Symmetry: C2
Subunit: 205 residues, 2 copies
């Protein structure tokens, strides 16, 4: 039975990289994300208004670190754009380019460990083991620009994590977020999307 | 409480359309028939459909009455490159197929899980209550593992968990020597029992 769950009792839970290019034209998404993941014992680092190069450079430098004592890795991306799902301040960012830094062979320190990419975008996925993507294309129903504007996906994701991190498995949490966001948009009448290549269960306790 | 898992106690489990396009795929097909039949699905079997015929099939099915059915399953077995769904004469786009089963277009399947098992031997429609189990490659690893996992764990494990073990099993066989891709817009837990 222990074989079916990811080992999450390493000395550290892992890093949580939050990138906020939403404001680039205190943030309610970034603040809620930080507090949520800090309560999960993640080392949270916040970034703001990064160019495409700066993001790639950041993700590379992160992959060169020693995650030997870390349980997992989390990256949260907030940005706007037209083509693709992640964006720098200049333009679109190749997701294949980023995830390659963390492939099982490229980053031995994260091999067999879950790599979580949370993505909020506003107006090609890499299939590698132990990777998970939870992305949204619609942040809210009206405006998502300044630091006071909230992303429905992100805010509900934090809420579900606050309530169910010590009970539900991660996919079940994401499913409840799917339902939460779907119900929110339905009240005013675009659902999030879970892309999972995980090989085990993810429990945060 | 029960409101967080899909209602699966309708008179019928639902349709399970198995599409076999172009030996190893024959074993997979027979395996899928037995597996879904034991889960009390109504299994319909197609062979060597053109891309036009696949679209027509999904259109006809989406125009049926699914009021008494809990879910919908479609398994596609085909080969080729530059696509994930192949007719015997070209690639098919999911956007065409899945949009017949949109929650606002197929009202008898609204809020009910719509599963697509795609096996492609060698463009994501984001809609609520859809799930895509996608793989690229007797019988094949992905289908053999999927069926064996369903047979063993349908009474206990929820679909995502079952699929997760399939990923592990397939990835391990690669190690001993690519991994399936799960795309979920499900809003509830899927248990094949009730």
């Amino acid at each position: 039975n222990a074989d079916n769950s990811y080992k999450m009792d390493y000395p550290e839970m892992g890093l949580c990289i939050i990138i906020n290019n939403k404001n680039f034209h205190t943030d309610v998404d970034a603040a809620n994300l930080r507090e949520t993941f800090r309560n999960l014992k993640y080392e949270v680092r916040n970034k703001n208004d990064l160019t495409r190069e700066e993001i790639v450079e950041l993700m590379r430098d992160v992959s060169k670190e020693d995650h030997s004592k870390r349980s997992s890795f989390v990256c949260v991306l907030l940005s706007h754009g037209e083509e693709g799902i992640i964006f720098g301040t200049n333009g679109p960012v190749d997701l294949k380019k980023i995830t390659n830094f963390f492939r099982g062979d490229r980053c031995r320190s994260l091999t067999g460990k879950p790599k979580l990419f949370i993505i909020q975008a506003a107006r090609k996925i890499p299939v590698e083991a132990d990777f998970l993507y939870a992305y949204s294309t619609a942040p809210g129903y009206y405006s998502w620009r300044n630091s006071k504007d909230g992303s429905w996906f992100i805010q509900s994701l934090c809420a579900m994590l606050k309530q169910y991190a010590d009970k539900l498995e991660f996919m079940h949490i994401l499913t409840r977020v799917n339902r939460k966001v779907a119900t929110e948009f339905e009240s005013f009448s675009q659902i999030p999307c879970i892309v999972s290549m995980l090989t085990k269960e993810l429990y945060f306790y």
